[PDB]
Amino acid sequence: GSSGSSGHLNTCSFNVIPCPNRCPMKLSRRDLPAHLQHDCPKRRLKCEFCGCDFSGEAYESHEGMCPQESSGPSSG
Ligand SMILES: [Zn+2]
Ligand SMILES: [Zn+2]
């Protein structure tokens, strides 16, 4: 089943390569260019409003639909 919408366990993949982004996630020598695009966690992309790491599929359509466009953190 798929419920929760959050981080999930991780298996021990084989015959693959680590991510250059320095993230604890390996894909392979083919899905590499498809992981650092919008499939990488440490892709290094934080919102300018809500300031919350996001993917490429979100950071894109999230630029206009941000949960914290104004309201921000208490101290910071
Ligand atoms: Zn990665
Ligand atoms: Zn945002």
Curated annotation (Swiss-Prot):
Expressed in epithelial cells of thymus, dendritic cells of lymph node, and in the basal cell layer of epithelia such as epidermis, nasopharynx, respiratory tract, salivary gland, and esophagus. It is found in: Cytoplasm; Nucleus; Cytoplasm, Perinuclear region; Cell junction, Tight junction. Polyubiquitinated, leading to its proteasomal degradation. Induction: Up-regulated by bacterial lipopolysaccharides (LPS) and by single-stranded CpG oligodeoxynucleotide. A zinc finger (TRAF-type) spans 8-60. Adapter protein with E3 ligase activity that is involved in many diverse biological processes including cell proliferation, migration, differentiation, DNA repair, platelet activation or apoptosis. Promotes EGFR-mediated signaling by facilitating the dimerization of EGFR and downstream AKT activation thereby promoting cell proliferation. Ubiquitinates SMURF2 through 'Lys-48'-linked ubiquitin chain leading to SMURF2 degradation through the proteasome and subsequently osteogenic differentiation. Homotrimer. Interacts with LTBR/TNFRSF3, NGFR/TNFRSF16, RPS6KB1 and TGFB1I1. Interacts with SMURF1. Interacts (via TRAF domain) with MAP3K4 (via kinase domain). Interacts with NCF1, TICAM1, IRAK1 and TRAF6, and is probably part of a complex containing TRAF4, NCF1, TICAM1, IRAK1 and TRAF6. Interacts (via MATH domain) with GP6 and GP1BB. Interacts with EGFR (via C-terminal region); this interaction promotes the formation of EGFR asymmetric dimers. Interacts with PKM; this interaction promotes PKM kinase activity. Belongs to the TNF receptor-associated factor family. B subfamily. The coiled coil domain mediates homo- and hetero-oligomerization. The MATH/TRAF domain binds to receptor cytoplasmic domains. This is TNF receptor-associated factor 4. The chain holds residues 102 to 164 of 470 of the full protein.
